[PDB]
Amino acid sequence: KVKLFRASEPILSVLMWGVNHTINELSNVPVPVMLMPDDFKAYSKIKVDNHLFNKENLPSRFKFKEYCPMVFRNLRERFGIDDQDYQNSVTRSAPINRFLTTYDRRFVIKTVSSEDVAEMHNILKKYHQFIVECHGNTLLPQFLGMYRLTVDGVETYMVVTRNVFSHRLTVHRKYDLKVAREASDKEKAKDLPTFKDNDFLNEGQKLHVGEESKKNFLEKLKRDVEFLAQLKIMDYSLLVGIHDVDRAEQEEMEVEERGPGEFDPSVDVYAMKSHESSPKKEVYFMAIIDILTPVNPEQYSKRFNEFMSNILT
Amino acid sequence: VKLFRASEPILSVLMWGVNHTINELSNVPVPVMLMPDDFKAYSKIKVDNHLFNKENLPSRFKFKEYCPMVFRNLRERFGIDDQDYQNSVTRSAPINRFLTTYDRRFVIKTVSSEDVAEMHNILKKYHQFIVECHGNTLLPQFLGMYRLTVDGVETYMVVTRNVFSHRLTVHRKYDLKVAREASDKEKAKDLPTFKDNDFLNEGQKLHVGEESKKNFLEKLKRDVEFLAQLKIMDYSLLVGIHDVDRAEQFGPGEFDPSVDVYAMKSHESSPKKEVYFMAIIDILTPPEQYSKRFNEFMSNIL
Numbered sequence A: 001k002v003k004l005f006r007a008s009e010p011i012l013s014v015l016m017w018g019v020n021h022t023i024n025e026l027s028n029v030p031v032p033v034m035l036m037p038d039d040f041k042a043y044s045k046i047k048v049d050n051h052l053f054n055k056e057n058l059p060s061r062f063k064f065k066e067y068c069p070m071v072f073r074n075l076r077e078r079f080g081i082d083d084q085d086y087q088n089s090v091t092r093s094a095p096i097n098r099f100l101t102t103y104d105r106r107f108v109i110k111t112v113s114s115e116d117v118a119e120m121h122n123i124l125k126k127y128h129q130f131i132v133e134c135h136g137n138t139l140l141p142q143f144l145g146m147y148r149l150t151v152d153g154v155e156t157y158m159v160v161t162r163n164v165f166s167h168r169l170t171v172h173r174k175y176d177l178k179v180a181r182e183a184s185d186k187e188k189a190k191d192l193p194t195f196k197d198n199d200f201l202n203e204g205q206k207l208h209v210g211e212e213s214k215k216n217f218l219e220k221l222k223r224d225v226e227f228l229a230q231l232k233i234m235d236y237s238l239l240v241g242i243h244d245v246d247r248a249e250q251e252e253m254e255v256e257e258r259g260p261g262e263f264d265p266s267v268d269v270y271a272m273k274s275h276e277s278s279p280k281k282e283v284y285f286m287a288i289i290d291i292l293t294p295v296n297p298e299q300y301s302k303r304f305n306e307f308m309s310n311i312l313t
Numbered sequence B: 001v002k003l004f005r006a007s008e009p010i011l012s013v014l015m016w017g018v019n020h021t022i023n024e025l026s027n028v029p030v031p032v033m034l035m036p037d038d039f040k041a042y043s044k045i046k047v048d049n050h051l052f053n054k055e056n057l058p059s060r061f062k063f064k065e066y067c068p069m070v071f072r073n074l075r076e077r078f079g080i081d082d083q084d085y086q087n088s089v090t091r092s093a094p095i096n097r098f099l100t101t102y103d104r105r106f107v108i109k110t111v112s113s114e115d116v117a118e119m120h121n122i123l124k125k126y127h128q129f130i131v132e133c134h135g136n137t138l139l140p141q142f143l144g145m146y147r148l149t150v151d152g153v154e155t156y157m158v159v160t161r162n163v164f165s166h167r168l169t170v171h172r173k174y175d176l177k178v179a180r181e182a183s184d185k186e187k188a189k190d191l192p193t194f195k196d197n198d199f200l201n202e203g204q205k206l207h208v209g210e211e212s213k214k215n216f217l218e219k220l221k222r223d224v225e226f227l228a229q230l231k232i233m234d235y236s237l238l239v240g241i242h243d244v245d246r247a248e249q250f251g252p253g254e255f256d257p258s259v260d261v262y263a264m265k266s267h268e269s270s271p272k273k274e275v276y277f278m279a280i281i282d283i284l285t286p287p288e289q290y291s292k293r294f295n296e297f298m299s300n301i302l
């Protein structure tokens, strides 16, 4: 039952301690009927000065700040995520890979800037309104928590989201789609490259999701990018991951010498199975990412939507 | 859901803090032994909330625990489970500075800076004594020492186990330590703390028998010899009497000796049927001869 908070770097130990602490505190606060405006301006701040005490894995001195915890608790709920699940994914064992996921591949933690935190604040009220109006059905990032860590006097901002990719299905290819950009030879020659727009058009990959799936997808994406434009946001990308059912079927047995393509929409919410009549058996993960940035954002909406339309069947 | 609702805000912080520290402690393993740094150690946390969780807590406060490994171990050596300790302090606000937990199981006393200094001066020898007598002792059982800062003003507290039964109403009180007696002022309260002389005037005796009295005396002698060997004085013996029959105006004169650890039933050959609670108190204010006179006083009462 004993959480040690052991991690490779002290900041991660503090991250685990902080999420554990704040979720436990959150469990003694009742759940409100609605959020009040003050809930959107609030924060929790704790400052720890231990001494000759509990130093095995944590620092003796550190600080942890959580932003709008009532709000992200509500978001967590509206996205179908249990607080106990959230805390466990972050604390049963250290996250891994600044860019991290929890041990269980369920959630992503990104280090971010002061400015990103500011923008998140400027948009949070309208974003929560959007999430609730669409019952959480959106390809936008699902923000579950925003925290600030101070260790060795250095502040570090982090934003927690749900992973776009399946937490079980191996992802075989990745694209970042938003002028004309392509993957550097440097990126092109690494373990799993983020292949930009130009490489996707060069390769001629299309995604065969089947009529009904494609339509629900495009309706959802149109609602979302129009929201982003109405918030005067741009430079956002659509993230795309390909899982090859048959290759996975092989490797889970090739390591064995030493359902297939089945997934849970309650967990892998951006996942989509390939059309029954498709060249190969694939699973796709597609969602919008990178929306805290702030040439025209209206034209951004229109161009982005036309491109993403022309990448599906 | 622990709301930490309390009578005065300092009590809310006490509840939050003991809750916090006991939960943190449950993620700290139990060491093979205590090390010297454990006797110099401390936990310190500082809270600045804002537009958040202000219903029952303050937005800004600070909480310090002294020697958490030691007091946790003491707790164990006194037969006290950490989760129980935490519940008694947090399931419901303490009551009536002098406090007990809602369930009347532990006493929370405000104490001075100097008292904290003294507790530190003695803690290692005291813990060693606790372990040497397997916790069977009449000395105060220190379960936790904490510093609270709320509105920038610090408040020190020591938690100990209660002398009296947490269920049985106690009917008369004597504080035995020269010549001290109860003032007309003190004499005119609901339960007076009647000092040494008035108990001898009243002519109440306590009939515990022989075997009971004998083992009791062995324990009292051990304790005061320890306190002398540490050059401590001005300590008092607290004694409370429960007269079952007055209570009659589920169980009568019934208690759990694992819980009311200082209780004793009266001898069959006794004036009335009584239950007695006896333990040493106020041992933080720093001749030896006090040991001998004190123990002699307590000798002639069985």
Ligand SMILES: Nc1nc(N)c2ncn([C@@H]3O[C@H](COP(=O)(O)OP(=O)(O)OP(=O)(O)O)[C@@H](O)[C@H]3O)c2n1
Binding pocket: A041, A114, A115, A117, A118, A119, A121, A122
């Ligand atoms: N639109 C908006 N609304 C808010 N409600 C809000 N809140 C914070 N930001 C921004 O990010 C930083 C947050 O940490 P803060 O710097 O504020 O944290 P704090 O000031 O306590 O500590 P420091 O002074 O030791 O850094 C701020 O400086 C801002 O750049 C906010 N932006």
Ligand SMILES: Nc1nc(N)c2ncn([C@@H]3O[C@H](COP(=O)(O)OP(=O)(O)O)[C@@H](O)[C@H]3O)c2n1
Binding pocket: A108, A161, A162, A163, A164, A165, A194, A237, A239, A289, A290, A291
């Ligand atoms: N699997 C998965 N699930 C998520 N929820 C998720 N969210 C963000 N990524 C990552 O965002 C990174 C770029 O991040 P981006 O915002 O473009 O910032 P830059 O790196 O350009 O500064 C991409 O390479 C993705 O790996 C995610 N990956």
